[PDB]
Amino acid sequence: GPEFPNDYDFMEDILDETMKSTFKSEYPFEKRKAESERIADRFPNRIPVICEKAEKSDIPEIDKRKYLVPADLTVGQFVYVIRKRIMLPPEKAIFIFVNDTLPPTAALMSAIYQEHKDKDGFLYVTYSGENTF
Numbered sequence: 452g453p454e455f456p457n458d459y460d461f462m463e464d465i466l467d468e469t470m471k472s473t474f475k476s477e478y479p480f481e482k483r484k485a486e487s488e489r490i491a492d493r494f495p496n497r498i499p500v501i502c503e504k505a506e507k508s509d510i511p512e513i514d515k516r517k518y519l520v521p522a523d524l525t526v527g528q529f530v531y532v533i534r535k536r537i538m539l540p541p542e543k544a545i546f547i548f549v550n551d552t553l554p555p556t557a558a559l560m561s562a563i564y565q566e567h568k569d570k571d572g573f574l575y576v577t578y579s580g581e582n583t584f
């Protein structure tokens with residue numbers, strides 16, 4: 452029994468480039484920057500991470516794509532949380548990319564933030580499975 456949003460049919464069999472849509476392209480830069488600035492004030496010791504599903508990847512979608520990551524949390528630990536959230540069976544694979552790269556699983560998310568944070572203050576991560584449509 453899928454949990455939200457995976458009780459919805461996304462109709463991937465006709466999803467087009469005219470329909471692709473992500474956090475950056477759905478919300479104005481200025482609104483995004485103001486939100487991460489608010490988080491720096493209100494949750495100072497959290498790293499704000501936008502985590503979204505790679506395009507056409509064969510893996511469940513995620514409800515909350517916005518994470519308040521503890522500063523000393525490793526990449527390995529963050530991957531485990533996403534796995535948990537999409538209820539991915541342990542026998543199926545999951546990878547996260549930063550700048551189209553697999554970060555080293557022992558790396559602190561704080562370090563990845565300092566190296567790769569967006570002009571808008573967020574860290575953008577992409578997750579995917581082994582296959583894609």
Ligand SMILES: CNC[C@H](O)c1ccc(O)c(O)c1
Pocket residue numbers: 452453454455458
């Ligand atoms: C699609 N029909 C309802 C939906 O499947 C649904 C309802 C309650 C839930 O807790 C749930 O995970 C999914």
